[PDB]
């Protein structure tokens, strides 16, 4: 049995998050199913469950007003609908087939078969190129701050790719504004600061923008 979550990776706040779980090598009608999500860097949260046989549902009480979980036996799918989303709904979403076993005549349910999960990001932001600011400096650390761009990704190089040693580019953060930010840093000899030119090259393909920032002491 294989589960594959599908749906838009981006949803605007107050709008509706919709996701479909395609199931192969198994029948929807003969099992119970659940949606579970995991915000970046956080723990798991059970959204809700549905009985493939009765169609009855059980939603997380803290999410009651948002959740709709339905089934489509025709195409062997089951879907999730989250209305009026906010930044709290940014997460990796998993569709799951529940396991069931009887122990001492007691029913035990667990999360048995999992899909790979899909990231859904909530942001009101539209496509926007980055603003690049210099992070001015034995050895010396200098960098550039790649601020307020959307969407991911960007790539960073130094001196058009001629500088790779000691270069470290960090993962992006999602700010409360709905825009991304990251930083790249390189460690260079202090004596090179007055002789060598250091430029960070930032490439943001989604907006077709490249920004080069000369970083000076």
């Amino acid at each position: 049995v294989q589960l594959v979550e599908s749906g838009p990776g981006l949803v605007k706040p107050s709008e509706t998050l919709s996701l479909t779980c395609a199931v192969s090598g198994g029948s929807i009608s003969t099992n119970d199913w659940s949606w579970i999500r995991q915000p970046p860097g956080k723990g798991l949260e059970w959204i809700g469950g549905i009985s493939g046989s009765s169609g009855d549902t059980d939603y997380n009480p803290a999410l009651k007003s948002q959740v709709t979980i339905s089934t489509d036996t025709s195409k062997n799918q089951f879907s999730l609908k989250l209305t009026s989303v906010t930044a709290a709904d940014t997460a990796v979403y998993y569709c799951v087939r529940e396991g069931i076993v009887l122990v001492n005549l007691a029913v035990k349910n667990w999360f048995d078969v999992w899909g790979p999960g899909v990231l859904v990001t909530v942001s009101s932001a539209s496509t926007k190129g980055p603003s690049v600011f210099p992070l001015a400096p034995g050895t010396a650390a200098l960098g550039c701050l790649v601020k307020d761009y959307f969407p991911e990704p960007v790539t960073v190089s130094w001196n058009s790719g001629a500088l790779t040693s000691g270069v470290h580019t960090f993962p992006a953060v999602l700010q409360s504004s709905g825009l991304y930010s990251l930083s790249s840093v390189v460690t260079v000899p202090s004596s090179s600061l007055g002789t060598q030119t250091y430029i960070c090259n930032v490439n943001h393909k989604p907006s077709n923008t490249k920004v080069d920032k000369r970083v000076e002491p």
Partner: protein, 216 residues
Amino acid sequence: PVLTQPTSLSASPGASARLSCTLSSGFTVGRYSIFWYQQKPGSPPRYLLYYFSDSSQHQGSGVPSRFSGSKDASANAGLLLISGLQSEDEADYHCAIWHSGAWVFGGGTRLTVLGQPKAAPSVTLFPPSSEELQANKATLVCLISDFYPGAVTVAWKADSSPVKAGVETTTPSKQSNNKYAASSYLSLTPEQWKSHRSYSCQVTHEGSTVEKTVAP
């Protein structure tokens, strides 16, 4: 929370891991079945087992006997015991219980199986650039590197007072030297930045805390 798990834990290969899942006092652990899941990077969680008592428990299919469940009544906690630790056992371990029409999850414990020497983090803190300030913005950038295991906590301070608002922090990831690095940001207004004596980025890693401070 209902279920409290340590954020991280580390142990040596071949040793034993004891992962705790502490239930808040309204939830007597003796009354609940504790479910455990194992999650490896970029991959969905995997059902390990559930445990209620010695006579009421079940192992997940394909899950070796070295993974076992137990309870600590005096601590009101569910336990996941792992013997003969292998490097592959490195994962995020989640506990869960069922209560009143809903599943409740713990925060998950990141277990590291030690595979290299421990190392305290190096910290570099950048003040807002002149260019950013002139664009009516201010960002403090705290770069953290060269640490192992890959679990740290980041706290920001305005003068000596803690600051939570405007903080974003990345999950630690390995660099080319096989050690971990992460980054944290503090967003400020130019006036906030200029009106304070100093701001600090404070990083905790196991028994050490490293703090860097910048001033306008």
